[PDB]
Design an enzyme around this catalytic site. Structure first.
Site, PDB file in Angstrom:
ATOM      1  N   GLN A  27       0.509  -0.964  -0.028  1.00 31.81           N
ATOM      2  CA  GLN A  27       0.039   0.092  -0.475  1.00 31.81           C
ATOM      3  C   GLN A  27       0.741   1.112  -0.239  1.00 31.81           C
ATOM      4  O   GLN A  27       0.684   2.133  -0.633  1.00 31.81           O
ATOM      5  CB  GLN A  27      -0.632   0.430   1.563  1.00 31.81           C
ATOM      6  CG  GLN A  27      -1.399  -1.090   1.546  1.00 31.81           C
ATOM      7  CD  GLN A  27      -2.776  -1.801   2.346  1.00 31.81           C
ATOM      8  OE1 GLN A  27      -3.834  -2.122   2.329  1.00 31.81           O
ATOM      9  NE2 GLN A  27      -2.390  -1.414   3.406  1.00 31.81           N
TER      10      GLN A  27
ATOM     11  N   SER B  11     -11.963   1.558  -0.866  1.00 32.89           N
ATOM     12  CA  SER B  11     -11.353   0.322  -0.887  1.00 32.89           C
ATOM     13  C   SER B  11     -11.619  -0.527  -0.110  1.00 32.89           C
ATOM     14  O   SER B  11     -11.847  -1.495   1.088  1.00 32.89           O
ATOM     15  CB  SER B  11     -10.293   0.744  -0.303  1.00 32.89           C
ATOM     16  OG  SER B  11      -8.825   0.974  -1.247  1.00 32.89           O
TER      17      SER B  11
ATOM     18  N   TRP C 271      -4.236  -2.618  -4.717  1.00 32.15           N
ATOM     19  CA  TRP C 271      -3.403  -1.561  -4.444  1.00 32.15           C
ATOM     20  C   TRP C 271      -2.465  -0.986  -5.598  1.00 32.15           C
ATOM     21  O   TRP C 271      -1.285  -0.198  -6.186  1.00 32.15           O
ATOM     22  CB  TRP C 271      -2.922  -0.826  -3.277  1.00 32.15           C
ATOM     23  CG  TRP C 271      -3.477  -0.900  -2.285  1.00 32.15           C
ATOM     24  CD1 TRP C 271      -5.183  -1.280  -1.304  1.00 32.15           C
ATOM     25  CD2 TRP C 271      -4.074   0.615  -1.884  1.00 32.15           C
ATOM     26  NE1 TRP C 271      -5.567  -0.122  -0.790  1.00 32.15           N
ATOM     27  CE2 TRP C 271      -5.184   1.154  -1.153  1.00 32.15           C
ATOM     28  CE3 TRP C 271      -3.675   1.880  -2.377  1.00 32.15           C
ATOM     29  CZ2 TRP C 271      -5.606   1.768  -0.537  1.00 32.15           C
ATOM     30  CZ3 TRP C 271      -3.761   2.776  -2.214  1.00 32.15           C
ATOM     31  CH2 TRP C 271      -4.609   3.158  -1.042  1.00 32.15           C
TER      32      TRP C 271
ATOM     33  N   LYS D 278     -14.328   1.822   9.571  1.00 30.20           N
ATOM     34  CA  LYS D 278     -12.941   1.214   8.326  1.00 30.20           C
ATOM     35  C   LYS D 278     -11.946   1.506   8.084  1.00 30.20           C
ATOM     36  O   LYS D 278     -11.355   2.424   7.687  1.00 30.20           O
ATOM     37  CB  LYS D 278     -13.380  -0.159   8.444  1.00 30.20           C
ATOM     38  CG  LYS D 278     -11.566  -1.376   8.432  1.00 30.20           C
ATOM     39  CD  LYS D 278     -11.807  -0.939   6.832  1.00 30.20           C
ATOM     40  CE  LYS D 278     -10.646  -1.116   6.136  1.00 30.20           C
ATOM     41  NZ  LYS D 278     -10.136  -1.274   4.308  1.00 30.20           N
TER      42      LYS D 278
ATOM     43  N   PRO E 216      -8.275  -0.311  12.016  1.00 33.11           N
ATOM     44  CA  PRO E 216      -9.544  -0.497  11.350  1.00 33.11           C
ATOM     45  C   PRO E 216      -9.982  -1.569  10.796  1.00 33.11           C
ATOM     46  O   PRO E 216      -9.263  -2.931  10.999  1.00 33.11           O
ATOM     47  CB  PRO E 216      -9.286   0.643   9.534  1.00 33.11           C
ATOM     48  CG  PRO E 216      -7.067   0.332   9.793  1.00 33.11           C
ATOM     49  CD  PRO E 216      -7.135   0.092  11.547  1.00 33.11           C
TER      50      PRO E 216
ATOM     51  N   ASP F  13     -11.787  -4.798   9.848  1.00 41.76           N
ATOM     52  CA  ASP F  13     -12.478  -5.900   8.438  1.00 41.76           C
ATOM     53  C   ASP F  13     -12.622  -6.938   9.051  1.00 41.76           C
ATOM     54  O   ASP F  13     -11.811  -7.496  10.773  1.00 41.76           O
ATOM     55  CB  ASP F  13     -11.710  -5.279   6.962  1.00 41.76           C
ATOM     56  CG  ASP F  13     -10.198  -6.349   7.390  1.00 41.76           C
ATOM     57  OD1 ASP F  13      -9.744  -5.999   8.717  1.00 41.76           O
ATOM     58  OD2 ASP F  13      -9.369  -6.224   6.643  1.00 41.76           O
TER      59      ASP F  13
ATOM     60  N   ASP G  21      -1.803  -1.904  13.122  1.00 40.44           N
ATOM     61  CA  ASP G  21      -2.455  -2.162  11.830  1.00 40.44           C
ATOM     62  C   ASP G  21      -1.715  -3.234  11.285  1.00 40.44           C
ATOM     63  O   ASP G  21      -2.017  -3.706  10.020  1.00 40.44           O
ATOM     64  CB  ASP G  21      -3.682  -0.892  11.094  1.00 40.44           C
ATOM     65  CG  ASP G  21      -4.131  -1.890   9.810  1.00 40.44           C
ATOM     66  OD1 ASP G  21      -4.951  -2.584   9.794  1.00 40.44           O
ATOM     67  OD2 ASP G  21      -3.452  -1.473   8.845  1.00 40.44           O
TER      68      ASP G  21
ATOM     69  N   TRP H 227      -1.314  -6.556   9.439  1.00 37.46           N
ATOM     70  CA  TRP H 227      -1.283  -7.039   8.092  1.00 37.46           C
ATOM     71  C   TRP H 227      -0.399  -8.170   8.080  1.00 37.46           C
ATOM     72  O   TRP H 227      -0.051  -9.179   7.252  1.00 37.46           O
ATOM     73  CB  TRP H 227      -0.509  -5.894   6.872  1.00 37.46           C
ATOM     74  CG  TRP H 227      -0.855  -6.209   5.762  1.00 37.46           C
ATOM     75  CD1 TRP H 227      -2.123  -6.473   5.141  1.00 37.46           C
ATOM     76  CD2 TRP H 227       0.286  -6.602   4.949  1.00 37.46           C
ATOM     77  NE1 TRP H 227      -1.641  -6.726   3.829  1.00 37.46           N
ATOM     78  CE2 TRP H 227      -0.745  -6.725   3.641  1.00 37.46           C
ATOM     79  CE3 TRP H 227       1.356  -6.109   5.024  1.00 37.46           C
ATOM     80  CZ2 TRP H 227       0.053  -7.186   2.519  1.00 37.46           C
ATOM     81  CZ3 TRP H 227       2.448  -6.560   3.719  1.00 37.46           C
ATOM     82  CH2 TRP H 227       1.577  -7.168   2.582  1.00 37.46           C
TER      83      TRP H 227
END
Length: 253
Positions: free
Chosen positions: A30, A57, A68, A139, A169, A171, A217, A221
Site C-alpha cells: 500500500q 477500498s 493497490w 474502517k 480499521p 475489517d 494495523d 497485516w
C-alpha cells in the site's frame, strides 16, 4: 482467557519498537503504490488520488493487495488533468472495483474536490466523516487516514507517528485475527458487527505497547499474511506470528 491473552499479546508486541513499525510500513505494498503515485503526481494530486482509492477500498472480494498494486501502476504511468473525472474513469476501468461500481463512483464524487490536510489528520478525519457520511471510527475512514500518512511520509521524507485516538480499521480479517489470538470469545462475524469492541482491545494494546492503533494495523497485516495466507514476509518475528495461532484452525492451508 481473554485477559491472559491480552497480557501475552502486549508483552510480546512490547518486543517491537514504534521505529521498527515505521520502517516496516515502507515495505507495505500500500505504501509503495501510494509513494509511486505521489512521486509521479506530487503531494497534492497524489494524496487526493490515494485518499479516493482508500475511500473505495471495500467489497473487494479478497483482492485488496492487487487493487493497490493496480492503483499504483495505473496512475504512476498516466498524466492526470481533471482529477475527479480521471478517478471516476479509473473506477470504471479497474478489474477490482466491479461490485457496486455505481455507489463507488457516488462516494468518490462526494469527496472529489476535497483536499485533505496532511498536517491535521484529526480535522481531516472529522471532515471525511461528514463528506462520506460515516462514523469517524468506521474502517474505511480510519484506513484512509493511514493511507494519507503514507502519502505524507513519502512526500516529505519523514516519519510521523499517528495519534493514539484514531482506532484500528476493523475489517473481517482484523476481526478474524483478534479471534485467532483469543482476545475475544465471540466469533469474527459478531466482532465485525461490534467493531468498537475490537477497537477497544487494540486501544489497550496500543496504550501498553506505545504503538498507536493505525501502526498496530501494519503488524496485523504482516501477521495475517503469514497466519491466514501462508505468506511469511519476515516482517514480524516468529513469536508475533504465533500470537495469532492460539485457536485451532488459525493456520495457513
Amino acid at each position: 482467557a481473554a485477559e491472559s491473552q491480552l497480557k501475552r499479546v502486549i508483552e510480546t508486541l512490547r518486543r517491537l519498537g514504534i521505529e521498527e513499525v515505521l520502517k516496516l510500513e515502507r515495505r507495505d505494498p500500500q505504501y509503495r503504490a501510494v509513494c509511486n503515485v505521489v512521486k509521479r503526481h506530487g503531494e497534492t494530486v497524489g494524496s487526493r488520488l490515494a485518499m479516493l482509492n482508500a475511500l473505495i477500498s471495500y467489497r473487494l472480494t479478497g483482492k485488496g493487495e492487487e487493487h493497490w498494486e493496480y492503483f499504483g501502476k495505473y496512475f504512476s504511468q498516466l498524466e492526470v488533468i481533471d482529477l475527479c473525472r480521471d478517478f471516476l474513469k479509473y473506477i470504471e476501468t479497474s478489474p477490482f472495483l466491479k461490485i457496486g461500481v455505481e455507489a463507488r463512483k457516488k462516494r468518490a464524487l462526494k469527496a472529489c474536490d476535497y483536499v485533505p490536510n496532511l498536517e491535521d489528520l484529526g480535522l481531516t478525519l472529522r471532515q471525511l466523516s461528514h463528506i462520506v457520511g460515516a462514523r469517524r471510527e468506521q474502517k474505511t475512514l480510519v484506513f484512509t487516514i493511514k493511507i494519507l500518512n503514507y502519502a505524507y511520509m513519502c512526500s516529505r521524507g519523514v516519519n510521523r507517528v499517528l495519534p493514539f485516538d484514531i482506532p484500528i480499521p476493523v475489517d473481517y480479517r482484523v476481526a478474524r485475527l483478534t479471534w485467532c489470538a483469543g482476545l475475544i470469545d465471540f466469533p469474527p462475524e459478531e466482532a465485525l458487527r461490534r467493531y468498537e469492541a475490537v477497537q477497544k482491545i487494540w486501544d489497550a494494546v496500543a496504550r501498553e505497547t506505545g504503538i498507536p492503533p493505525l501502526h498496530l494495523d501494519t503488524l496485523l497485516w504482516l501477521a495475517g499474511r503469514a497466519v491466514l495466507y501462508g505468506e511469511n514476509l519476515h516482517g514480524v518475528p516468529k513469536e508475533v506470528i504465533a500470537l495469532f495461532q492460539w485457536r485451532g484452525g488459525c493456520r495457513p492451508p
